[PDB]
Ligand binder design. Structure first.
Ligand SMILES: [Mg+2]
Ligand SMILES: [Mg+2]
Ligand SMILES: [Mg+2]
Ligand SMILES: [Mg+2]
Ligand SMILES: [Mg+2]
Ligand SMILES: [Mg+2]
Ligand SMILES: [Mg+2]
Ligand SMILES: [Mg+2]
Ligand SMILES: [Mg+2]
Lengths: 124, 208, 99, 150, 83, 138
RNA sequence: GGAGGCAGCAGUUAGGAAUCUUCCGCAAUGGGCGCAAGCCUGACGGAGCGACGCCGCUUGGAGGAAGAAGCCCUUCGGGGUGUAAACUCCUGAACCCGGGACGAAACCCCCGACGAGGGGACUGACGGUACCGGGGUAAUAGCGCCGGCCAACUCCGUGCCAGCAGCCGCGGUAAUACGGAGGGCGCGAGCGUUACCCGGAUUCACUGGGCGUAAAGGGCGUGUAGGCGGCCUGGGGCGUCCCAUGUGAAAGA
């Protein structure tokens, strides 16, 4: 634009989009598993992926990935939702925080232990 | 902080002989002499040519390891140097070298910089007559750095000040072996320290 | 000091009041161009002495009504119906912006 | 005994009846760290000949860098294609503040302290070529006074 | 009324006051009319009580009351002695 | 009808220099001359002279170049590598003395209109005055 | 018929991913009342809890093998962990003993005049705390990452499963990308994660971008407001520039 145009109409400041109505802009959210179930990924990948539909304190029911080999979530398990999507399950915008509320840690886990909510194993 | 854990193992990896044990890292032993390759299952394999990052990471790490200083303390020390007047590289060394734990090593009251830390920290050092136990303490031009009167005749201190009869202490300093006193005269010039460290690459590390 | 402003009389439809239009110019805070904005001031004229086209110093004052906080200081020059016509064209053009 | 720094290796491909067919391209900077630098882009059916040729062409395309205590006489912005390099002298202690491509180029020229921005298209090649064009256009106070006399 | 009094600065276990003149109704640490001295009750430095006497006198003469504790400190720097 | 005669003058210089003209003509103004006075004084141009094309005042400006050069492309280097209007009718640029620019780190010149005349950055700074940033040259 | 209004300090309860003691003391500073003594002061000064944040400090130091064992790799000679340990000396966090603050000199009292000025008395929550002296024990280490960006690689298990994932994408039976081991890199009483802001983003571009074909010239005139306006001389001095001066509180920088 000419400077006069810029005077008259100016520049539109960007404005940008949450990936994550964990409402409020909370960093986490309590919810209850409504359904726990397995789903299949989008074309390139193939798996039986573990997700829970989750009804939230935030007023919203959404799906959420259950990370870790193995889990203990069932129909009313309480859960901490985390944010983070999965490039592979469409409309899974959130993860479940293992190690919190009714989400158990991941058993036998020994490497990336603090994700996966796993207590430091005893070196008896 | 001060790391705590195997040293003449980064006397290696940096691939260049720091002096973390003082006395042994002079014997046919600093492993630079024996095993001048990085630690671990690899180490003696084909060196892959370093990324521009690794070049600088290593240079930064080299310098830091030399003084036994936490990265948080180091970056701070560095950011202070940058704001300070004139050449950030040179100045930054001078600030590292102004440290009490290191001044004490440069005086040879202690063999290694680790040791100097432990001495300072245990009340054995005194600056201008009052006792200081803060390794990080900043030493200023004109300060008397002595050995505490009660500590004066300790096995380790006599050994160490016995070896200082003979030696020349770096030009920016004075030493009084008989009376166990030292004087920080001025800040170290960039050349007064023959450091195995291109400090200009360290500035560049912090530019990212 | 009491703020003095000068500008033209663009209305004298009121009793003992003239509407006085003040142009002013500032650099744009970001883009720097000198811009020209304008404000109208109701100005006390207790002796209905000022007429349309009069260019007048306006001076800050003890409130005289809601809106009126400026008396007419003096008459810089007279019959500038060109500046009056300008403002009225700007005003009449509004009739052609609605639905 | 110029130094040499290997800036870019890539493998291009072209097409033939039933086949992709490859070729390599190497961008190599060559320089003494004392005001002389070279850029060369070499291609060959295998990597080391490409690097080799690059080396050759660089030593054959070199430049007057007018250093001044490890920095540069004055600002320059060069556009090369849709790539842009901005170059700003700096006092000592600054370091060479630059992307990997123009860093290499400036280090081997013997630049110690300088500030830079890659703008526009970051394509390493056109950035390289523009860094070079920038330095090729630097002038010293002396170069300038000489140009204007009587 | 207006006051000559100690505004607390410094830090925890580090009292360092400013001798300041201020409406009585301000909060203690609030806005003040003018600074005149400073005071360090622990004399950690030799220049631990300072006062600008010629100003304190202006303020006393236009009806500022000093705090007991402030008075003591102006007295000590001879705001009150008159030869 | 020419919106910016100064700009047009600078542009006549740049256009001429890029084809290595001996000289060029620019319709005359006192202000234009004062700019040229400086270009000359700083050695970007050999100098100018008033003249009269078809009954009308121009300033014929005499361009200056470097030596002819070696290799493919022997075109002289420009003395005027760059000449750019700053202040312009659509956005006037004004700067006081303490924020006058240093152009190309000293090797360039800025030019401004001041209440003491048309000065360079160096003249102005040493006179203590700001003004309109007419243009920068290097 | 009455009573009530913690968005005062604490605290409860609910909501929440989540945020403290129903603490000590008016000794200080400040406030209200009083001639004063003094009363009141959840302002305040302190203590407590929380790695929430920042700064500082410790978990040893010097010696110690062509190099134990274990464990990992192995081309079955070795190689790695590693001077790391064991081991010898040395020092002595914590502890325990003794001593022990500054912060507090006024108000008041007496001489002087109930002024200035000189002299006297009381007063400490924090706190038996800080700190000083004397004894004195080798005394917590973990977290993330090692496909590229990005610093750091081998073996086993697995076989589009389990799983990883910020993007490219990894996983189909030799996977440096899954899981574990050893090894490494990076930080270190922390290390990661998620959320949000700026950066990178010259990707709203004043600095500092664009529209033939990438997104972008209005289908074309006419024209209102508006924006912009050739050459010369004078007056004004609004823009503009200069100087002085006031203001730009404190804190922060
Ligand atoms: Mg992982
Ligand atoms: Mg781009
Ligand atoms: Mg709840
Ligand atoms: Mg931006
Ligand atoms: Mg664009
Ligand atoms: Mg198309
Ligand atoms: Mg198009
Ligand atoms: Mg068209
Ligand atoms: Mg018009």
């Amino acid at each position: 634009p000419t400077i006069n145009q810029l005077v008259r109409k100016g520049r539109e400041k960007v404005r940008k989009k949450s990936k994550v109505p964990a409402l409020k802009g909370a960093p986490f959210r309590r919810g209850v598993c409504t359904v726990v179930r397995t789903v299949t990924p989008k074309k390139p990948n193939s798996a039986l992926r573990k997700v829970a539909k989750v009804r939230l304190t935030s007023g919203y029911e959404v799906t959420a990935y259950i990370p870790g080999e193995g889990h203990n979530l069932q129909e009313h398990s309480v859960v901490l939702i985390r944010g983070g999507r999965v490039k592979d399950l469409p409309g899974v915008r959130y993860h479940i925080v293992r190690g919190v509320y009714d989400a158990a840690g991941v058993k036998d886990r020994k490497k990336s232990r603090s994700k996966y909510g796993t207590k430091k194993p005893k070196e008896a | 902080g001060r790391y705590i854990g195997p040293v003449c193992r980064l006397c290696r990896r940096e691939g260049v002989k720091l002096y973390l044990k003082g006395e042994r890292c002079y014997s046919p032993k600093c492993a630079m002499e024996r095993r001048p390759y990085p630690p671990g299952q690899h180490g003696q394999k084909r060196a892959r040519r370093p990324s521009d990052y690794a070049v600088r990471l290593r240079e930064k790490q080299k310098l830091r390891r030399i003084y036994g200083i936490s990265e948080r303390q180091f970056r701070n020390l560095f950011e202070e140097a940058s704001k300070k007047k004139g050449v950030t590289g040179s100045v930054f060394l001078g600030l590292l070298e102004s440290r009490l734990d290191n001044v004490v090593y440069r005086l040879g009251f202690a063999v290694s910089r680790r040791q100097a830390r432990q001495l300072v920290r245990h009340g054995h050092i005194t600056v201008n007559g009052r006792r200081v136990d803060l390794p990080s303490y900043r030493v200023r031009p004109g300060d008397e750095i002595a050995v505490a009167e009660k500590s004066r005749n300790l096995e380790l201190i006599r050994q160490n000040l016995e070896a200082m009869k003979g030696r020349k202490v770096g030009p920016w300093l004075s030493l009084d072996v008989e009376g166990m006193k030292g004087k920080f005269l001025r800040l170290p010039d960039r050349e007064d320290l023959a450091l195995p460290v291109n400090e200009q690459l360290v500035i560049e590390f912090y530019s990212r | 000091p009491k703020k003095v402003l000068t500008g033209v009389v663009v209305s004298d439809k009121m009793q003992k009041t003239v509407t006085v239009l003040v142009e002013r110019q500032f650099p744009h805070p970001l883009y720097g161009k000198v811009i020209k904005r304008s404000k109208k001031y109701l100005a006390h004229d207790p002796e209905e002495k000022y007429k349309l086209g009069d260019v007048v110093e306006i001076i800050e004052s003890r409130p005289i009504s809601k809106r009126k906080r400026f008396r007419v200081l003096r008459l810089v020059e007279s019959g500038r119906m060109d500046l009056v016509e300008k403002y009225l064209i700007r005003r009449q053009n509004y009739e052609s912006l609605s639905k | 005994d110029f130094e040499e720094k290997m800036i870019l290796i890539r493998r291009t491909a072209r097409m033939q009846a039933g086949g992709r067919r490859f070729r390599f391209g190497a961008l190599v900077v060559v320089g003494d760290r004392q005001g002389r630098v070279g850029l060369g882009f070499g291609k060959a059916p295998e990597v080391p000949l490409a690097v080799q040729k690059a080396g050759y062409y660089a030593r054959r395309n070199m430049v007057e860098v007018p250093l001044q205590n490890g920095t540069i006489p004055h600002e320059i912005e060069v556009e090369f294609g849709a790539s842009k390099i901005v170059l700003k002298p700096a006092a000592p202690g600054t370091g060479v503040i630059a992307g990997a491509v123009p860093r290499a180029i400036l280090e081997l020229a013997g630049v110690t302290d300088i500030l830079t921005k890659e703008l526009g298209s970051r394509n390493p090649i056109n950035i390289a070529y523009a860094t070079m064009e920038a330095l090729r256009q630097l002038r010293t106070k002396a170069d300038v006074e000489r140009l204007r006399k009587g | 009324m207006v006051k000559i009094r100690l505004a607390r600065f410094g830090s925890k276990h580090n009292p360092h006051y400013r001798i300041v003149v201020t409406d009585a109704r301000r909060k203690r640490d609030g806005k003040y009319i003018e600074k005149i001295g400073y005071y360090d009750p622990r004399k950690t430095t030799p220049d631990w009580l300072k006062v600008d006497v010629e100003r304190a006198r202006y303020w006393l003469s236009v009806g500022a009351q000093p705090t007991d504790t402030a008075r003591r400190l102006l007295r000590q720097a001879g705001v009150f002695r008159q030869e | 009808m020419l919106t910016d005669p100064i700009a047009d003058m600078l542009t006549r210089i740049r256009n001429a220099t890029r084809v290595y003209k001996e000289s060029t003509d620019v319709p005359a103004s006192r202000f234009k001359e004062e700019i040229l006075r400086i270009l000359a004084r700083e050695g970007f141009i050999k100098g100018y002279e008033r003249v009269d094309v078809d009954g009308k005042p121009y300033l014929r400006v005499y361009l200056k170049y470097g030596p002819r050069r070696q290799g493919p492309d022997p075109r002289p280097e420009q003395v005027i590598h760059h000449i750019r209007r700053i202040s312009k009718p659509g956005r006037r640029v004004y700067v006081g003395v303490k924020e006058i620019p240093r152009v190309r780190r000293g090797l360039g010149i800025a030019i401004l209109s001041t209440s003491k005349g048309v000065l360079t950055d160096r003249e102005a700074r040493k006179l203590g005055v700001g003004g309109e940033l007419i243009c920068e040259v290097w």
